Short mmCIF file of C-alpha atoms and ligand atoms in Angstrom, two decimals:
data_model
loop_
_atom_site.label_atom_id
_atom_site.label_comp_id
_atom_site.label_asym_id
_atom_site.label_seq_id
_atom_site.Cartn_x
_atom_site.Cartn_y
_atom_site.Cartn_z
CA UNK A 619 102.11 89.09 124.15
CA UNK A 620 101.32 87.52 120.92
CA UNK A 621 104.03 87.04 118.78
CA UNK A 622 101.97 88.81 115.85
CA UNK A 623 98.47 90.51 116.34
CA UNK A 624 96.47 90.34 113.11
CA UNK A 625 93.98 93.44 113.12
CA UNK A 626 91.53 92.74 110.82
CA UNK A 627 90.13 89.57 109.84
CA UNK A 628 88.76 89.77 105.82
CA UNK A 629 90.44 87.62 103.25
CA UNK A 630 94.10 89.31 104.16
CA UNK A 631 94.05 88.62 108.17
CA UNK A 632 92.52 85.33 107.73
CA UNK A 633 95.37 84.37 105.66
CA UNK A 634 98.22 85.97 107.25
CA UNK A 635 96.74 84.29 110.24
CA UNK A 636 96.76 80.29 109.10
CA UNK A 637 100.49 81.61 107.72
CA UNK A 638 101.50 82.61 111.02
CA UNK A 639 99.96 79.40 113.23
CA UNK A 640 101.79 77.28 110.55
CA UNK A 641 105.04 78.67 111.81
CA UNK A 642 103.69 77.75 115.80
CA UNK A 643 104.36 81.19 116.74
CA UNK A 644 101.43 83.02 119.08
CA UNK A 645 99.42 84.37 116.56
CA UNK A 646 96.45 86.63 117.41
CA UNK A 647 93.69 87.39 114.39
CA UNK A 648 91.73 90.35 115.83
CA UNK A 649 88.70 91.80 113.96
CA UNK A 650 85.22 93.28 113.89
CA UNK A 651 83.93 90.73 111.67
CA UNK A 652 85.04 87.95 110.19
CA UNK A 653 85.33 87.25 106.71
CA UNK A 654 85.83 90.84 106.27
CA UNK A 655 83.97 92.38 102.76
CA UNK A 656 83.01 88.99 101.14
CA UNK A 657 80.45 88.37 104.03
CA UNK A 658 78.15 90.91 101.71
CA UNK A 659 78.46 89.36 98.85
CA UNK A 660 76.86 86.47 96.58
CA UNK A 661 78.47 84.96 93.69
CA UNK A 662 82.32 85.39 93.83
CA UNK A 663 83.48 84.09 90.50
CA UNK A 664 87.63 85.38 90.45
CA UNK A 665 88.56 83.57 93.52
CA UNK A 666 91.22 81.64 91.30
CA UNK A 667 90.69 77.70 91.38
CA UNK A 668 87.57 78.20 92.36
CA UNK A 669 85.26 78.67 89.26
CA UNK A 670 82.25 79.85 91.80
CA UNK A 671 81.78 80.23 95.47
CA UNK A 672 79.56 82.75 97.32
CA UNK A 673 80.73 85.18 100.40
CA UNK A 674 79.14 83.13 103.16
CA UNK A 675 80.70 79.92 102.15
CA UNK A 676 84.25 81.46 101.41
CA UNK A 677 84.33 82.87 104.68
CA UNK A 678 83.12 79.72 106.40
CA UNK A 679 85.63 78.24 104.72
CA UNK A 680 88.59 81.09 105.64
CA UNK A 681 87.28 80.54 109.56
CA UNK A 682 87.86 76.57 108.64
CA UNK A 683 91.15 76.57 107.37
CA UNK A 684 92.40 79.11 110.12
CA UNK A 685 91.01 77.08 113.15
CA UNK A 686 92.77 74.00 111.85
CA UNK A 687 96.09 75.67 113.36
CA UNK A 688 96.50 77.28 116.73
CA UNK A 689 94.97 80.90 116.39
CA UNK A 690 93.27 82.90 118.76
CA UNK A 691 90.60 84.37 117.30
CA UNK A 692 89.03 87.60 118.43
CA UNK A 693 86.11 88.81 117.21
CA UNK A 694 83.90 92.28 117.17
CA UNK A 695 86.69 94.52 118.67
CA UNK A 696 87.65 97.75 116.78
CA UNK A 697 91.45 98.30 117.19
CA UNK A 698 91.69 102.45 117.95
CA UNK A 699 95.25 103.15 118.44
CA UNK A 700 98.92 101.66 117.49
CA UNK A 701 101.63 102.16 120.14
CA UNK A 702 104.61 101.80 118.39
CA UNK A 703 107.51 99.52 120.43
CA UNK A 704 109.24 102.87 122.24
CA UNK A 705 112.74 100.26 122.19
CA UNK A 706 113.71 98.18 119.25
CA UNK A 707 112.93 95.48 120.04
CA UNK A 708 109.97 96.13 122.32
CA UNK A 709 106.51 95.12 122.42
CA UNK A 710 104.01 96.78 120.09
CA UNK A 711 100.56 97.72 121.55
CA UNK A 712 96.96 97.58 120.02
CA UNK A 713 94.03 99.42 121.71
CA UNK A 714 90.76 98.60 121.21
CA UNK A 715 87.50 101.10 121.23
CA UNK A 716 85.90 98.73 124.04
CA UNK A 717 89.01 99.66 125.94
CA UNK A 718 91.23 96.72 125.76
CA UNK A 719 95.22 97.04 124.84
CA UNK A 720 96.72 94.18 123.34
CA UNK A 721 100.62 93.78 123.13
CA UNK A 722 102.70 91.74 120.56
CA UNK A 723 106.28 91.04 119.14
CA UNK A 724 104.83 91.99 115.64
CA UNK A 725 101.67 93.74 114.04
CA UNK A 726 100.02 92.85 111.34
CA UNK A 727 97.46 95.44 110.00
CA UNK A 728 94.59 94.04 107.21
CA UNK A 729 91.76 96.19 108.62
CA UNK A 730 90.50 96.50 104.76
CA UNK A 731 88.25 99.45 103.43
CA UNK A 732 84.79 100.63 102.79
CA UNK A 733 83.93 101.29 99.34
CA UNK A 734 81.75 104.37 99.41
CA UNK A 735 78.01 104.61 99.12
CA UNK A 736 75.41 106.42 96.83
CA UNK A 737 73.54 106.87 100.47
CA UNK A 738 69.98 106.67 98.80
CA UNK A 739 66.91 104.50 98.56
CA UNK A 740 66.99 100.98 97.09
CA UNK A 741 70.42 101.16 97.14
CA UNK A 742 71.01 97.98 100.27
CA UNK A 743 68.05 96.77 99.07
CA UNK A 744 69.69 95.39 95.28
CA UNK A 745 72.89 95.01 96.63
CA UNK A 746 73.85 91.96 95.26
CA UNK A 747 71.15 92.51 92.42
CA UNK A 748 72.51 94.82 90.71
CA UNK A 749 73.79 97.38 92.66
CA UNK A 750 77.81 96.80 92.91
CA UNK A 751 80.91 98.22 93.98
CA UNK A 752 83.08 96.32 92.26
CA UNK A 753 83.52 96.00 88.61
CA UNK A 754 86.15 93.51 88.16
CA UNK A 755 83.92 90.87 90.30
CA UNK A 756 80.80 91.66 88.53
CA UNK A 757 81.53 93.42 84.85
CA UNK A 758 81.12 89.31 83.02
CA UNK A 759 77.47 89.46 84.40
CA UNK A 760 76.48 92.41 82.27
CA UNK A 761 76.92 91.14 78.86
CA UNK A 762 74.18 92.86 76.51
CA UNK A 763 72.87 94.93 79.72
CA UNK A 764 72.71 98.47 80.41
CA UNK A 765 74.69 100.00 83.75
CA UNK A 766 75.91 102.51 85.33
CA UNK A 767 79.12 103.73 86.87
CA UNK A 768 78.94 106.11 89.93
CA UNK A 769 82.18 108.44 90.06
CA UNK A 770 84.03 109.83 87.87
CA UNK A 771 88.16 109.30 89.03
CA UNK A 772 90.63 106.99 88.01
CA UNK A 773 88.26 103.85 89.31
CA UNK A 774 85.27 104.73 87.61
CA UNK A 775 85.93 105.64 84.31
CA UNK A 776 88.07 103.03 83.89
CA UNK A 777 85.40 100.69 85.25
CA UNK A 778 83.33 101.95 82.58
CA UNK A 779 85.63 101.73 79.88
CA UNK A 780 86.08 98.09 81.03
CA UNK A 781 82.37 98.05 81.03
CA UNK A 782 81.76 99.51 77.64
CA UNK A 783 83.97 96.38 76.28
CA UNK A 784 81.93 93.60 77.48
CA UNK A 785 78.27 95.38 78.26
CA UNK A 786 75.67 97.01 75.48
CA UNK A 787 75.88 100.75 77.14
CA UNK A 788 77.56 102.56 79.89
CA UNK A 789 76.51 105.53 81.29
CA UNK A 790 79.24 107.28 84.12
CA UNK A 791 77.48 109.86 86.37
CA UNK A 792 80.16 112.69 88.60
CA UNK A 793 78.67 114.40 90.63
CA UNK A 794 81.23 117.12 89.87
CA UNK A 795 81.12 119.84 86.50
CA UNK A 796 84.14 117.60 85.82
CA UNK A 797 85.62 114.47 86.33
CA UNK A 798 89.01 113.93 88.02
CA UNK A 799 90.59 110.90 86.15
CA UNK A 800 93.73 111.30 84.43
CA UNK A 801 92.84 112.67 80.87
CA UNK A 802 94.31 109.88 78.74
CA UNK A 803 91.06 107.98 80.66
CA UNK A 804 88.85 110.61 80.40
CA UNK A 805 89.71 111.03 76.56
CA UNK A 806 89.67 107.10 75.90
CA UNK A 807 85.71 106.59 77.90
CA UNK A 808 84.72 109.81 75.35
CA UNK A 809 85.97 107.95 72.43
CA UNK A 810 83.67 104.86 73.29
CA UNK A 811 80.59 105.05 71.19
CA UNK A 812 78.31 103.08 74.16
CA UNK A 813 78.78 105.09 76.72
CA UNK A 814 77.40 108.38 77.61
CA UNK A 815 78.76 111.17 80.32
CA UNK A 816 76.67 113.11 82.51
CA UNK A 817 78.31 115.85 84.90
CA UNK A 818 76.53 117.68 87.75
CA UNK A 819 74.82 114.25 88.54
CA UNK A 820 73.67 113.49 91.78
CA UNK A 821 71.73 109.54 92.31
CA UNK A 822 68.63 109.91 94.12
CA UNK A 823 67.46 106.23 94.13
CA UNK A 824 67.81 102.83 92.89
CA UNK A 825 65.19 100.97 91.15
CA UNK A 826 64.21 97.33 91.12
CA UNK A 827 60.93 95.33 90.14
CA UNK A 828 61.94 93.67 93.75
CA UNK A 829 63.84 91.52 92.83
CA UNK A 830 66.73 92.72 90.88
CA UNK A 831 67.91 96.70 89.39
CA UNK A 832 65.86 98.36 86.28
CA UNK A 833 66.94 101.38 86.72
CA UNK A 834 68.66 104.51 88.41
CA UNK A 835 66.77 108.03 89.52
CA UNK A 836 69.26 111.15 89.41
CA UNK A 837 68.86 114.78 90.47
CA UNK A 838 71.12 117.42 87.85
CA UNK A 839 72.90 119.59 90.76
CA UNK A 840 72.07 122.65 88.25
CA UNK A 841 69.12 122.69 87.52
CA UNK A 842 67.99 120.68 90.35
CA UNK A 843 66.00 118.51 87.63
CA UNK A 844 65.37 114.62 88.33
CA UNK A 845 66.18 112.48 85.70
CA UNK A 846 65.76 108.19 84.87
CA UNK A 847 67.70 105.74 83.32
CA UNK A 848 66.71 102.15 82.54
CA UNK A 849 69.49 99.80 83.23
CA UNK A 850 70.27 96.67 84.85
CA UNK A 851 73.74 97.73 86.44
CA UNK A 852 75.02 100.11 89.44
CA UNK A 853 78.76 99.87 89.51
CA UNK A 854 79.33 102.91 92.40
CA UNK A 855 83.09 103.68 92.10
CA UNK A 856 82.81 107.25 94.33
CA UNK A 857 85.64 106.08 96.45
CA UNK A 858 86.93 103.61 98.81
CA UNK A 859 88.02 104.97 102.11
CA UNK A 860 90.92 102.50 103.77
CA UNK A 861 90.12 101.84 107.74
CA UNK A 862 93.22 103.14 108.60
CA UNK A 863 92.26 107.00 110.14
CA UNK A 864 93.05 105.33 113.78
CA UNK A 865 96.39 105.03 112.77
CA UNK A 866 96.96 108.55 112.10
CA UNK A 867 100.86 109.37 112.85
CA UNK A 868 101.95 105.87 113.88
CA UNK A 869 102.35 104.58 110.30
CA UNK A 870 102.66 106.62 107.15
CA UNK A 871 99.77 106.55 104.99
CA UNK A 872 99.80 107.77 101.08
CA UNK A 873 97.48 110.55 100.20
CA UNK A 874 94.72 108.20 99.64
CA UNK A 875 95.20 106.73 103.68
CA UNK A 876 96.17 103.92 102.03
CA UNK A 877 99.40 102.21 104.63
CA UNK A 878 102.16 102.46 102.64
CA UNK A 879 104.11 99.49 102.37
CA UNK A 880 107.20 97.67 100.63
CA UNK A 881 106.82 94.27 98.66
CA UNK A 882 107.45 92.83 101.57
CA UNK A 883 104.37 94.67 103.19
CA UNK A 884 106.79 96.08 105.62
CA UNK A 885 105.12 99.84 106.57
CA UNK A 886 107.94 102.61 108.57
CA UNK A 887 107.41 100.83 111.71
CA UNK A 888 109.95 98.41 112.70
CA UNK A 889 107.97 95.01 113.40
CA UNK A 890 104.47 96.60 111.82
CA UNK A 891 103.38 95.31 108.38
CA UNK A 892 99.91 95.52 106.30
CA UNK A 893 98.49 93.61 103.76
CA UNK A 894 95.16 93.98 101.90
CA UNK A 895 93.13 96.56 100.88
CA UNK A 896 93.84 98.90 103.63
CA UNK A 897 97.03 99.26 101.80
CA UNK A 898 98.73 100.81 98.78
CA UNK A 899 98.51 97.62 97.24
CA UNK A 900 97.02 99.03 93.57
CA UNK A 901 94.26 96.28 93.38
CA UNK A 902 91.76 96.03 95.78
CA UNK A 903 90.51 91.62 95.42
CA UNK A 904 90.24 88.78 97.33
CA UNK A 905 92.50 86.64 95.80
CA UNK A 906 95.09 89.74 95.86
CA UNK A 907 94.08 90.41 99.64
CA UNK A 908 95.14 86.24 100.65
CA UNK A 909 98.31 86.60 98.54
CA UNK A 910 99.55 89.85 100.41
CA UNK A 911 98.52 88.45 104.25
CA UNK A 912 100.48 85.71 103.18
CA UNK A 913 103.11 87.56 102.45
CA UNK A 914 103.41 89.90 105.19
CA UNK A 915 103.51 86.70 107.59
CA UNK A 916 106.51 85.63 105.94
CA UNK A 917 108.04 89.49 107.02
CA UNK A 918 106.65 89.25 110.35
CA UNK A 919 108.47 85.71 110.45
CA UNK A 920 111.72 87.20 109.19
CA UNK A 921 111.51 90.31 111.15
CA UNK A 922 111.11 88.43 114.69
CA UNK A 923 113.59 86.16 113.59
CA UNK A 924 115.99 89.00 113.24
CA UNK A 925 115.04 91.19 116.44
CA UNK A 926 116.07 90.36 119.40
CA UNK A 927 113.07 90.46 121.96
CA UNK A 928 113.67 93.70 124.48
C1 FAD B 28 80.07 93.83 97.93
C2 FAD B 28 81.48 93.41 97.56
C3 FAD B 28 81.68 92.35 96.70
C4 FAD B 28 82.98 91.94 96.36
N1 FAD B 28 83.10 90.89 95.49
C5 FAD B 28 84.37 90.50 95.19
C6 FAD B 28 84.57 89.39 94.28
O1 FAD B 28 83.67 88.77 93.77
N2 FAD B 28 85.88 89.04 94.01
C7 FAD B 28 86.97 89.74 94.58
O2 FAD B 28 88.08 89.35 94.29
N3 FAD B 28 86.79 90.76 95.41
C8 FAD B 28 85.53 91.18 95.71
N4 FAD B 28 85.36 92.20 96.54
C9 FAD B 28 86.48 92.93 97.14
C10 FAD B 28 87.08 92.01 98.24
O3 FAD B 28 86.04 91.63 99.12
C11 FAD B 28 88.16 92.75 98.98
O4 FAD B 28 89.19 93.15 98.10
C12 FAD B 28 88.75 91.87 100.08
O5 FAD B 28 87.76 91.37 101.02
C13 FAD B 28 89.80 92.71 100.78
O6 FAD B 28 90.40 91.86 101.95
P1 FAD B 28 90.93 92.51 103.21
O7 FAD B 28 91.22 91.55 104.18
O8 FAD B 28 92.11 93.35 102.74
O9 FAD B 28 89.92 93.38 103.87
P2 FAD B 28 88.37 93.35 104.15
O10 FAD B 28 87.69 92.29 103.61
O11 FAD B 28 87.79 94.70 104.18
O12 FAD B 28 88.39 93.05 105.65
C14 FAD B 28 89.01 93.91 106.68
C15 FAD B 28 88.31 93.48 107.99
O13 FAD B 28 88.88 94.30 109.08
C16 FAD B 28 87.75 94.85 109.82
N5 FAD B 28 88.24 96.06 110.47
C17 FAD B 28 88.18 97.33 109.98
N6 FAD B 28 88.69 98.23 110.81
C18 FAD B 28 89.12 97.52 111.90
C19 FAD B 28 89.76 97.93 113.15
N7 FAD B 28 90.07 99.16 113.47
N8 FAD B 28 90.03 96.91 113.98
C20 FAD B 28 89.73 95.62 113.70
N9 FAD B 28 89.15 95.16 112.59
C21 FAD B 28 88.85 96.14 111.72
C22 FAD B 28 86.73 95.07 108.75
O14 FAD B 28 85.50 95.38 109.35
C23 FAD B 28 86.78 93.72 108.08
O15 FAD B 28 86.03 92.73 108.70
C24 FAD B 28 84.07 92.65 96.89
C25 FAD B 28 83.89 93.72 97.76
C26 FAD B 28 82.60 94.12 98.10
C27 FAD B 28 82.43 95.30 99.04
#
C-alpha cells in the first residue's frame, strides 16, 4: 500500500512523483511509458528556463531527477479500473489490464491524452517535420511559411488565428459543412486576410520531399474531388481525447472526459486527485503539466495528513 500511486508517468506523474519522494512518503509512479507525450517530440522550446531541449533528453532528465528520491517506478502497465476506498479512510485500489491491483492511501491520476490523428499517409512519417499537433510549441517555427490547421473547434481556429499572426498564410480545413468554434472565433479567423476556410474537407495525405512537409492532399466530402496545397505546416487540432474512459463512474469527468478537478487538483473522490492533461486544466503543456503534478502532491500530502488511515 503505497501511500500515493501515480498513474501515469508524462511530465505531470514524473513531477508529482519527485514531489511526493521528497516528503519520504511511499510513493508509487505507475505508467505505460515514461516521459509520457514529449518522448515523440524534437525541439521543445517553452519548457521555461530552458531556452531549448528535445523530448528524449527532457525525459531522461524527468527519469533523473525522480530516481534521485525513493520512487518505485513501474513501467508499461495500463491502469483499467479505480476502486474507490468503500470507508473513509480506506485504501484506494488501481487495476491494471495485465491483471495486477495495486492499493494506496492516495491516487494520483496524470494518465495525459492523445491528440487526435489525420489517420493518413505521410502523416508519422513528418511528424516532427512538419506535421504537428501542437501550435503553441511549434507556431515561432513558421514565420513566412505556409500551414495548415486540421479542425475546425475552439482549438483550431484559434490555432490558426494565432497562426495567421506570426506565419505568411493559414489555411483551416473541417471536415464538417461548418465549423463548431464559438462564433466570436469563427468571425475573428474570417476577418484575417491570410487565411483561407475550406468546409467539407477531408486530408488524404501528407507530403514531404523526405525530409520535411511541402504540402497537404485533401478529398472535398461533396464532390468527392481531391485537392493540393503547398505548405510547410500541419497543425492537426481535430481533438484530443483525455485517457480517462477507464475511469468511467469512479470520478466525474466534464463533457470533454476531461477529470474534473479543483485548484487543488482534488477530483469527487476523497483521497483521488489529477493533474495534467488528462484534466480540465484549460492548457494542455509541459511546463503546465509539472506545475499541476506538483501541485496535486501537495493535496495528496495534505489530504493523508488529514485522514486518518482505516
Ligand atoms: C508531438 C507533441 C509535441 C509536443 N511538444 C510540446 C512542446 O514543445 N512544449 C509543450 O509545452 N508541450 C508540448 N506538447 C504537449 C505536452 O507534451 C503535454 O502537454 C504534456 O506531456 C502533458 O503531460 P502529462 O503528464 O499530463 O501527460 P502525458 O505526457 O500524456 O503523459 C501521460 C502518460 O500516462 C500514460 N498513460 C495513459 N493512460 C494510462 C493508464 N491507463 N495507465 C497508466 N499510464 C497511462 C501515457 O501513455 C503517458 O505515458 C507536445 C505534445 C505532443 C503530442
Amino acid at each position: 500500500a503505497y501511500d500515493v500511486l501515480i498513474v501515469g508517468s508524462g511530465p505531470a506523474g514524473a513531477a508529482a512523483a519527485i514531489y511526493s519522494a521528497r516528503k519520504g512518503i511511499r510513493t508509487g509512479l505507475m505508467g505505460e511509458r515514461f516521459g509520457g507525450q514529449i518522448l515523440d517530440t524534437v525541439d521543445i522550446e517553452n519548457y521555461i528556463s530552458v531556452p531549448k531541449t528535445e523530448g528524449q533528453k527532457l525525459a531522461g532528465a524527468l527519469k533523473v531527477h525522480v530516481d534521485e528520491y525513493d520512487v518505485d517506478v513501474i513501467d508499461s502497465q495500463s491502469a483499467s479500473k479505480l476502486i474507490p476506498a468503500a470507508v473513509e479512510g480506506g485504501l484506494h485500489q488501481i487495476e491494471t489490464a495485465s491483471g495486477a491491483v495495486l492499493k494506496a492511501r492516495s491516487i494520483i491520476v496524470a494518465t495525459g491524452a492523445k491528440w487526435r490523428n489525420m489517420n493518413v499517409p505521410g502523416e508519422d512519417q513528418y511528424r516532427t517535420k512538419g506535421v504537428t499537433y501542437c501550435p503553441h510549441c511549434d507556431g515561432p517555427l513558421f514565420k513566412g511559411k505556409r500551414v495548415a490547421v486540421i479542425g475546425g473547434g475552439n482549438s483550431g481556429v484559434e490555432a490558426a488565428i494565432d497562426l495567421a499572426g506570426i506565419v505568411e498564410h493559414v489555411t483551416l480545413l473541417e471536415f464538417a459543412p461548418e465549423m463548431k468554434a464559438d462564433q466570436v472565433l469563427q468571425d475573428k479567423l474570417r476577418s484575417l486576410k491570410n487565411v483561407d476556410i475550406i468546409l467539407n474537407a477531408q486530408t488524404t495525405e501528407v507530403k514531404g520531399d523526405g525530409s520535411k512537409v511541402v504540402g497537404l492532399e485533401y478529398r472535398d466530402r461533396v464532390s468527392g474531388d481531391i485537392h493540393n496545397i503547398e505548405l510547410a505546416g500541419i497543425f492537426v487540432q481535430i481533438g484530443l481525447l483525455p485517457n480517462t474512459n477507464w475511469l468511467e463512474g469512479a470520478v466525474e469527468r466534464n463533457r470533454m472526459g476531461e477529470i474534473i478537478i479543483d485548484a487543488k487538483c482534488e477530483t469527487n473522490v476523497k483521497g483521488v486527485f489529477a493533474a495534467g492533461d488528462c484534466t480540465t486544466v484549460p492548457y494542455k503543456q509541459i511546463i503546465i503539466a509539472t506545475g499541476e503534478g506538483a501541485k496535486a502532491s501537495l493535496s495528496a500530502f495534505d489530504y493523508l495528513i488529514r485522514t486518518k488511515t482505516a
